[PDB]
Write a protein that binds this DNA or RNA. Structure first.
Ligand SMILES: Cc1nn(-c2nc3ccccc3[nH]2)c(O)c1[C@@H]1OC(=O)c2ccccc21
Ligand SMILES: [Zn+2]
Length: 357
DNA sequence: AAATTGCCGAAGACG
DNA sequence: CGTCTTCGGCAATT
């Protein structure tokens, strides 16, 4: 039953090929545009992130995330209040002549300025694209992404995400995050935390407005590693190892949410990342590959449903990397919203998930 | 040195 | 289930 739904969600190779060919042409052209002289973003490098590059994208290959990461040396971070995720950015000594001089605000590096110039450079390059149907989606507050809309003639979106790369140690609000010691282990955890961290220009929402200079922590690179290296046994899902159903559970939960979101706008505040975060905790909670045997698919899905409902009910979903940050706090999602999503989930759970059709 | 090339894991396709 | 395939990611190389 759940296998038959997975078959439907599975992407088709001809679709992948058609989408990939077009997406790669467009992105590689922006990247090189960004590589150009006079640009502030001259040293940006590409990093592919998100559902598609983690092999957890469902239904159609119609959404692509790409991080244009910029190695910015020597930055001091100041925690924006006690959020743990959001930050103001200063430089240690002024870099003499600085490519990012123009994005400054006294001593603070404005995310809004830097994104706006990034967006402007992308918009100008996209207008020059003639062989392909592409446009830049209207800017949306609360988004670090400059979003492309491609008609291939299939509708494809590409989120291009400016990121600052910092090679220093991770900010202390992450110090008790990534609790993978009993699962992927301490060598993996330590090694992952020796990798750079990223800031993306998603602004903290003060109240009714955004704080235009703030940045947000991104662990999209770390998450991608984990999705590809997700078992306690090194050979999980390898050619001389056992297949598990961890990713299949993520896809089923992703689908259940996306179906509910399509017809209920009371659910607009929720999104895939809530689901991904929840399954990260599941994987931590049940680290043994044996617990995610494909034959146990139904009960792993139901256990994930159960955990998620409990997160809704208690209004608490800890960010996996930043445990202070509650993705289900009253302040980000109203109680009523969470209670709405609960009853719909419970209903689909006690009725054999009719919405899967 | 920006771009090509070589390698192979992840996973779709098919019997 | 096995085998074949395309895509993605890496970094050595020219
Ligand atoms: C609600 C949400 N949070 N979120 C998110 N919060 C983070 C905090 C710290 C680090 C990464 C985060 N990603 C995140 O990626 C989303 C969804 O991704 C979005 O771009 C988005 C947009 C509208 C609603 C929900 C989301
Ligand atoms: Zn596995």
């Amino acid at each position: 039953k759940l296998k038959k739904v997975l078959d439907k969600l599975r992407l088709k190779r001809k679709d992948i090929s058609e989408a990939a060919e077009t997406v790669n042409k467009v992105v590689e052209r922006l990247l090189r545009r960004m590589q150009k002289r006079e640009s502030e973003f001259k040293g940006v490098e590409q990093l592919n992130t998100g559902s598609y590059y983690e092999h957890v994208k469902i239904s159609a290959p119609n959404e692509f995330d790409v991080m244009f990461k910029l190695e910015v040396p020597r930055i001091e971070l100041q925690e924006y209040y006690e959020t743990g995720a959001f930050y103001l950015v200063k430089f240690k000594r002024i870099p003499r002549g600085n490519p990012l001089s123009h994005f400054l605000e006294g001593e603070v590096l404005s995310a809004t300025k830097m994104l706006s110039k990034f967006r402007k450079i992308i918009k100008e390059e996209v207008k020059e694209i003639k062989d392909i149907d592409v446009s830049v989606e209207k800017e949306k507050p609360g988004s670090p992404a400059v979003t492309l809309l491609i008609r291939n003639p299939e509708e494809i979106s590409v989120d291009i995400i400016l990121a600052l790369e910092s090679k220093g140690s991770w900010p202390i609000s992450t110090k008790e995050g990534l609790p993978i010691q009993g699962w992927l282990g301490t060598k993996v955890r330590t090694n992952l935390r020796r990798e750079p961290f990223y800031l993306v220009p998603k602004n903290a929402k003060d109240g009714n407005s955004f704080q235009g200079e703030t940045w947000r922590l991104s662990f999209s690179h770390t998450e991608k590693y984990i999705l590809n290296n997700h078992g306690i046994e090194k050979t999980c899902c390898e050619s001389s190892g056992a297949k598990c159903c961890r990713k299949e559970c993520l896809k089923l939960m992703k689908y259940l949410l996306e179906q509910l979101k399509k017809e209920f706008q009371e659910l607009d505040a929720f999104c895939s990342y809530h689901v991904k975060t929840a399954i990260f905790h599941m994987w931590t909670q049940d680290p043994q590959d044996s617990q995610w045997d494909p034959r146990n698919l139904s009960s792993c899905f139901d256990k994930l449903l159960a955990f998620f409902l409990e997160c809704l009910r208690t209004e608490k979903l800890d960010h996996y990397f930043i445990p202070k940050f509650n993705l289900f706090s009253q302040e980000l999602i109203d109680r009523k919203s969470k209670e709405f999503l609960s009853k719909k989930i419970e209903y689909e759970r006690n009725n054999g998930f009719p919405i899967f059709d």
